[PDB]
Amino acid sequence: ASKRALVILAKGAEEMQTVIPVDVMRRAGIKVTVAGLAGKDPVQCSRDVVICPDASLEDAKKEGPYDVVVLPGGNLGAQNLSESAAVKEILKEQENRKGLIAAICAGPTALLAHEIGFGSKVTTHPLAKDKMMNGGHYTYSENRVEKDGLILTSRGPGTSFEFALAIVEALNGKEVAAQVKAPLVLK
Amino acid sequence: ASKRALVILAKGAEEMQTVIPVDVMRRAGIKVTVAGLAGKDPVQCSRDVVICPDASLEDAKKEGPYDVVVLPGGNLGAQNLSESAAVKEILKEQENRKGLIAAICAGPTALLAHEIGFGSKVTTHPLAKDKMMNGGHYTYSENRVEKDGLILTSRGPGTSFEFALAIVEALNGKEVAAQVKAPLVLK
């Protein structure tokens, strides 16, 4: 049995924070679905890379549940995630079933918007801290990857490999994470 | 005047090595064209991320020359680059005009195939060393990024940020590279 990941891809997502986790998770033998928030259509990311999702979010949800739901960053992508009732329902359901949620950079601010994981330690991009911390519902961390049980967060493009490998470790264990890491040529 | 980059995107390319350089170069204010080897159509990368190119290679070439030509890795992507007469012509012309060529992971093996940059120090992914070194036409390096004048090479997914920032430094200078680097949250 392989583990399954849902990566929710919205217009304005940080493309590095979409592709690095998708690719590293696939290297780990996780079955990853790249789901488009807005539909099946191609998604224009924050730096204009255009990615074709595997499925619409509507369709991907019918094929769940997933062992992890992953929220990339990029401020505009994160805002689109935050404004989506469909994302609210997916995240609520994932929390309710005690499944992992992982978010990077501005992505964790969608957790705030949807009232997910309050009382957790979290990190974000430094520039997203004040937004995430509005109301004091989370405790902030400067660790490059933070994991407080089922809420896994990270900071930026440059922490994306660490973020992805932390997801791999959570789902498939330390040994698999180490095996996937070596061929990447990380320092 | 802004600097211009051509990123040549073939089926089986390493998607992290496509997106990280495109995104970081765009952050640096470089005008980047993602050109599809095979045409305008979407490209299925090595770990099944599907990227829509900006233009066909045929069309992108008419809009050159470029300050850098970038070759992502992924073994199958690199082989498709290596087998393309169009890539041969672009790389020959770039070399002839004394323009920068940058290649990562298995990407430098396309330089071998097209007889580009012989006599240079180069690096590759460790697993691509023997292929690159067939005939002893280059001198090998284990540096994470190697730059021998106009031939800039790098090793793997985990060296892609360093690779991209080395391209930025070469085109736009150290100050711009440092400014682009800080918001990435690199260690």
UniProtKB/Swiss-Prot annotation, chains A, B:
The known PTMs are summarized as: Sumoylated on Lys-129 by PIAS2 or PIAS4; which is enhanced after ultraviolet irradiation and essential for cell-growth promoting activity and transforming activity. Cys-105 is easily oxidized to sulfinic acid.
In this UniProt entry, the residues modified to N6-succinyllysine are K181
Q: Which UniProt keywords apply?
A: Acetylation, Autophagy, Cell membrane, Chaperone, Copper, Cytoplasm, Disease variant, DNA damage, DNA repair, Endoplasmic reticulum, Fertilization, Hydrolase, Inflammatory response, Isopeptide bond, Lipoprotein, Membrane, Mitochondrion, Neurodegeneration, Nucleus, Oxidation, Palmitate, Parkinson disease, Parkinsonism, Phosphoprotein, Protease, RNA-binding, Stress response, Tumor suppressor, Ubl conjugation, Zymogen
N6-acetyllysine modified-residue sites: K147
The broad enzyme category this protein falls into is hydrolase
GO MF annotations in UniProt: cadherin binding; copper ion binding; cupric ion binding; cuprous ion binding; cytokine binding; DNA-binding transcription factor binding; enzyme activator activity; enzyme binding
Q: What is its EC number?
A: 3.1.2.-, 3.5.1.-, 3.5.1.124
Stated consequence of mutating L9P: In PARK7; uncertain significance
Q: Where is this site: Cleavage?
A: D148, G149
Phenotype for C52A: Strongly reduces chaperone activity and ability to eliminate hydrogen peroxide
Q: Name one GO biological process term.
A: detection of oxidative stress
Residues lipid-modified (S-palmitoyl cysteine):
C45, C52, C105
Q: Which PANTHER family match?
A: PARKINSON DISEASE PROTEIN 7 HOMOLOG, PROTEIN/NUCLEIC ACID DEGLYCASE DJ-1-RELATED
Matching NCBIfam families: not_thiJ
What is the designated name of this protein? Parkinson disease protein 7
**What organism does this protein naturally occur in?**
Homo sapiens (Human)
Write the gene name: PARK7
